[PDB]
Amino acid sequence: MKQYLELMQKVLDEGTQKNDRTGTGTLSIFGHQMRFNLQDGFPLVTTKRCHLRSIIHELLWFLQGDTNIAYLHENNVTIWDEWADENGDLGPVYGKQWRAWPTPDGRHIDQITTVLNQLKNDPDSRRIIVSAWNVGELDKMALAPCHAFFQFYVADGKLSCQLYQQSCDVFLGLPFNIASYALLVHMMAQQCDLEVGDFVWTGGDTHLYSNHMDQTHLQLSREPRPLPKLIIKRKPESIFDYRFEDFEIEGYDPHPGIKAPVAI
Amino acid sequence: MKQYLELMQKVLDEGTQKNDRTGTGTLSIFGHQMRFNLQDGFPLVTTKRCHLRSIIHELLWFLQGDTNIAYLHENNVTIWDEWADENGDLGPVYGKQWRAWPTPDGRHIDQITTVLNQLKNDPDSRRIIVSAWNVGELDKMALAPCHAFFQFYVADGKLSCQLYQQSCDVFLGLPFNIASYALLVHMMAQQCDLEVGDFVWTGGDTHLYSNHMDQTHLQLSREPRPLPKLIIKRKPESIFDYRFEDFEIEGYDPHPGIKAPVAI
């Protein structure tokens, strides 16, 4: 999509040479923000095919507060294998923090429910936040949250949301992230009888890996097709009762996919 | 300044009517981002006089990990009286979280030192973050952090920083916030032998109180004067050894100040 391709280009033009923890070089910029009107359609990148299946199962997994890849495996979803240990444990990552942020006094806050209450009983609140950045359990995590902070906003029956991605692989991870959170916005709005507003994406260290240049130029040459339409076949009793089948993407006609290898 | 006045205007033009917890109406927009090249000068609003004194003492106070207003009082700084209790306690706010984020296992993480180590020993890290958003101690706080998440970034000997302000009073609080964090960038860079890069400001619910319209239009009519220059008279042995006198703003010739009343 336009906003996306615009970023991709910007990174090429303005990105400074920076290396990552693996030794692979990246082109990076710091601080960027793009908006996506959700009424204009589901922000699923078209200039390259994306498989929403993994996306959906991962989101549902998070909402379950599960941090073991078992569920993912039952559905043959392996995007988390790379990090899980022999038992399939990733540590207190996303899911754990969202649904059971542990306090120093023995409690476990359910940030998702907390957020739902607010959207329903105090929509003008300015602190409708979900944070995965738990300083206390960083070490125990398989890896630090790429996207670790998001805020919800209500105005005119429209529910918006801003995500802050402190670190971002523009080519491989960004497309996935945008769709994932966009889907979360819809689920939230559905349970709150609210219309979807804007999904605002903000990033810190936004980069492209040096060995992704050709794929970038190749995609950067395709023309964005119209955005598809996300439809929810039903209205679960809660934000925790959605099932894979409830979602159906409609009108998605992407260009072919583009493989993006990684060094190890 | 330009970026600032541009926001002020945008809020007037595009802001939607929203009410706050006190009942006072605000004009608000969601999601905004402005950049400030720190080499161009210290971002201290000129179209209206700002007293940096309070700013500095508050920053130093934070770095001390102190959450009692006593220190502020010794210097006759009352910006926190409104919230402090009879003992002058504000709860586990900013200072406490920055210097002693409490873990569930009895520890207290020093996010400021943590961050300093990283900038000195692993500058390419993408997780150089400081968070005041401790879900565990929200209730015990005098009020929730307006600005609760910031990231540091290094590239070409230039240290940048992005702050995310989930809630923002454009007229009263924003100017104060920008200068405060800009000063922190400089202190950081000084202790890391790095040059200052960009201070990137991102906001969630960015608003103007309905009863600040005249002041807004009045300021919105002034022309930005050149930015002053921030100078540090010395190099303390650590980020915790700065004293009020070490800072000197130079070339600051602002327009007159503008009072901004608040309802209660």
UniProtKB/Swiss-Prot annotation, chains A, B:
Its EC number is 2.1.1.45. Transmembrane segments: none annotated. It is an enzyme of class 2 (transferase). (6R)-5,10-methylene-5,6,7,8-tetrahydrofolate binds at residues 51, 169, 263. Changing residue 126 to E: Shows 2000-fold decrease in catalytic activity and 600-fold decrease in affinity for dUMP. Keywords: Cytoplasm, Formylation, Methyltransferase, Nucleotide biosynthesis, Repressor, RNA-binding, Transferase, Translation regulation. GO terms for molecular function: magnesium ion binding; protein homodimerization activity; RNA binding; thymidylate synthase activity. Although not discussed in the published references, Met-1 is represented in the submitted PDB entries as being modified by either a formyl, or a carboxyl group. The N-terminal is probably N-(dihydroxymethyl)methionine, the hydrated form of N-formylmethionine. It holds the Pfam family Thymidylat_synt. The keyword Methyltransferase applies. The active site is at residue 146. DUMP binds at residues 21, 126-127, 166-169, 177, 207-209. Pathway: Pyrimidine metabolism; dTTP biosynthesis. NCBIfam families: PRK01827.1-3, PRK01827.1-5, thym_sym. Catalyzes the reductive methylation of 2'-deoxyuridine-5'-monophosphate (dUMP) to 2'-deoxythymidine-5'-monophosphate (dTMP) while utilizing 5,10-methylenetetrahydrofolate (mTHF) as the methyl donor and reductant in the reaction, yielding dihydrofolate (DHF) as a by-product. This enzymatic reaction provides an intracellular de novo source of dTMP, an essential precursor for DNA biosynthesis. This protein also binds to its mRNA thus repressing its own translation. Belongs to the thymidylate synthase family. Bacterial-type ThyA subfamily. This is Thymidylate synthase. It comes from Escherichia coli (strain K12).
